[PDB]
Write a protein that binds this ligand. Sequence first.
Ligand SMILES: O=C(Nc1ccc(-c2cncs2)cc1)c1cc(C(=O)c2ccccc2C(F)(F)F)c[nH]1
Ligand SMILES: O=C(Nc1ccc(-c2cncs2)cc1)c1cc(C(=O)c2ccccc2C(F)(F)F)c[nH]1
Ligand SMILES: O=C(Nc1ccc(-c2cncs2)cc1)c1cc(C(=O)c2ccccc2C(F)(F)F)c[nH]1
Ligand SMILES: O=C(Nc1ccc(-c2cncs2)cc1)c1cc(C(=O)c2ccccc2C(F)(F)F)c[nH]1
Lengths: 164, 164, 164, 164
Amino acid sequence: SKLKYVLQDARFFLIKSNNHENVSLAKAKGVWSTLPVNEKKLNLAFRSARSVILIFSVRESGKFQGFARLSSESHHGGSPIHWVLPAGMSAKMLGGVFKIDWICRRELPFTKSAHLTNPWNEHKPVKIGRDGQEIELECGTQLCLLFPPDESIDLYQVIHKMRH
Amino acid sequence: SKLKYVLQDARFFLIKSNNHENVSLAKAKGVWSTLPVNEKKLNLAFRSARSVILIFSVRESGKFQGFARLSSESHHGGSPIHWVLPAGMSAKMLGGVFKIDWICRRELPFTKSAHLTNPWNEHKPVKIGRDGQEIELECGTQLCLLFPPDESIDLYQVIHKMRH
Amino acid sequence: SKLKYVLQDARFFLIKSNNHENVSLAKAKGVWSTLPVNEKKLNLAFRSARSVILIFSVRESGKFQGFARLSSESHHGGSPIHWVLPAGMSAKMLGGVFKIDWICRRELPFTKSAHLTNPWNEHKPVKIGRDGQEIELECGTQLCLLFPPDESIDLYQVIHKMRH
Amino acid sequence: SKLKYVLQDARFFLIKSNNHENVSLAKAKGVWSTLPVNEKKLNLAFRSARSVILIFSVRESGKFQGFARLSSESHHGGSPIHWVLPAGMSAKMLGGVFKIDWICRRELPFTKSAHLTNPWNEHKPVKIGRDGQEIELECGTQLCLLFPPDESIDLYQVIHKMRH
Ligand SMILES: O=C(Nc1ccc(-c2cncs2)cc1)c1cc(C(=O)c2ccccc2C(F)(F)F)c[nH]1
Ligand SMILES: O=C(Nc1ccc(-c2cncs2)cc1)c1cc(C(=O)c2ccccc2C(F)(F)F)c[nH]1
Ligand SMILES: O=C(Nc1ccc(-c2cncs2)cc1)c1cc(C(=O)c2ccccc2C(F)(F)F)c[nH]1
Ligand SMILES: O=C(Nc1ccc(-c2cncs2)cc1)c1cc(C(=O)c2ccccc2C(F)(F)F)c[nH]1
């Protein structure tokens, strides 16, 4: 029930990382960053929706690595984070830093989501999509409910940080 | 006295634009933008100082065009603004949008500031500096006091938006 | 023998694309592009090595899609190419265009290269690597020899464009 | 006569730098660089025009610092060049390096060109223009002829590098 409360009326985005290190840093530090165009879209979504849920997948892994709620709009951030940037990209191109509240840090293999389709991506399987693909409400809710419950996470701390 | 109150313990930055259009848009809309690296520095300065004052100069103009107080940290912004970007730069590289409260929208020719030197730039005349050059407290205060008073601006509205 | 001739003393790079579209365009038009940092690295490699071989893999495909020889240093480009760019990145950030001479446009599944490890990447299977990972001479040679012969390609045309 | 020969049928571009350092480096090393969008435009102009002439002006200097002929399309570069970059921009964003053949390294004050208007920029004085502004043939020719002869330059070396 607590997870479903967190997910009520949420918007869902599929976030694809080229490597494991960025998702590991996000789990360790509770933060996320991206290019300004995407940052703008996330900030708009954050102000417009009861919750914004990021569902993370490392390409070539065949799995989702967890999901998290946007905790606030982006801000300047602290000391540099050693993100692993795509070949040739300068860290000077990154925007601000989002604080994220992890709801599940456990993995879900794509084999377990093979029955779900995203109406907002031509009913392709929900694993399929470009970085930032939005997942329709009911599909995104079912996908999140497929993850194993994460006993290392206190959903009350997630619920307390909600300001809807 | 009101202007001096606004300037108390402020930090001052010299902001140089390649063209008039960006400063005109900033006066019309009460906003400013820049690349993320600079945005980060302005956001940090905003949280650290009683006031952050931007002093604007259009290159090749021989003048300052006015000065404004940072009103808040940067945010996603509204509809695109038709900023005039340097040749070859994508608007996708810009960070968020700062709201600024204009304190003076009138010009000051460089000839009138020729007696002031910036200790934080090797005592070069205060007109001299790369974009973002910081101006020492007393020098920056004297420079702002050289501008003609702007009767079109209500300093009470500036003072009311201060949250120190 | 013709393939082994082209590959003599070659340098090999694993090129990872996040979508099929860019590799399909490269196959149709015989060109490639990327960010200026990587463009510089490819131009340096082209000028010094007898051949530079790009081995392409679309992430999440579980296959290599083919491989090609760099035919020239990068140049202006000519006609526009509707590359698919990472979210939030501008085509204005891209460097010039390389002419590439395809050697094989047929696919090779990762299962077929399970016995090849790359000694310049910690002896990990050669399918593993960040974008641009260099592959040691003998490992890259054997990987290219694993691809099925591509009758649609005239290796004499590839060989005749060599200027060693 | 030698100068008029070099300038026959040339295209002329006004290049505006925000600091003296970049123009000083260009004069010392005989090279130029810029963002890929502008690099593409310069490479196109080089391939089609008999000569491409870059006329340099450091903003706020009130002078042109000299002019040079594009000697080649852009290339990798070679040795590093410690260009001064706009605040917040990364050297990784820059394109390749153009070889330039200086024709005059002596300065021309704007007061000396007050009679030349650029018909491809609304008949504004030729000193006026955004970075990269193209200058009509006869106006650019007369502007270059206004510079003082530069005995330190051997125009035969410039002429011998022409490949029209
Ligand atoms: O946040 C990401 N992407 C996104 C795309 C679109 C949209 C939206 C579009 N429309 C509505 S939301 C939202 C987010 C996004 C980030 C990464 C990283 O690996 C990463 C992480 C941190 C720093 C640097 C990087 C790195 F530079 F390496 F990329 C992959 N993805
Ligand atoms: O804000 C600017 N620069 C800055 C530099 C350094 C620092 C700091 C460094 N350290 C502490 S603060 C702060 C601000 C800055 C902006 C401009 C513009 O013309 C402009 C305006 C709006 C949109 C796009 C642009 C455009 F893209 F065209 F540039 C010039 N300047
Ligand atoms: O060329 C690429 N990468 C590379 C990295 C490192 C090195 C080297 C490092 N050291 C020696 S070589 C060489 C090449 C590279 C390109 C892509 C694309 O999908 C692509 C294709 C065309 C246009 C735009 C893009 C897009 F913008 F979408 F990316 C993925 N990869
Ligand atoms: O080359 C430049 N601009 C250009 C604009 C448009 C066009 C054309 C448009 N249409 C046909 S040609 C051609 C050239 C241009 C370069 C600079 C620099 O100071 C500079 C120099 C070297 C490295 C880095 C920089 C720095 F990063 F600092 F900028 C100013 N300007």
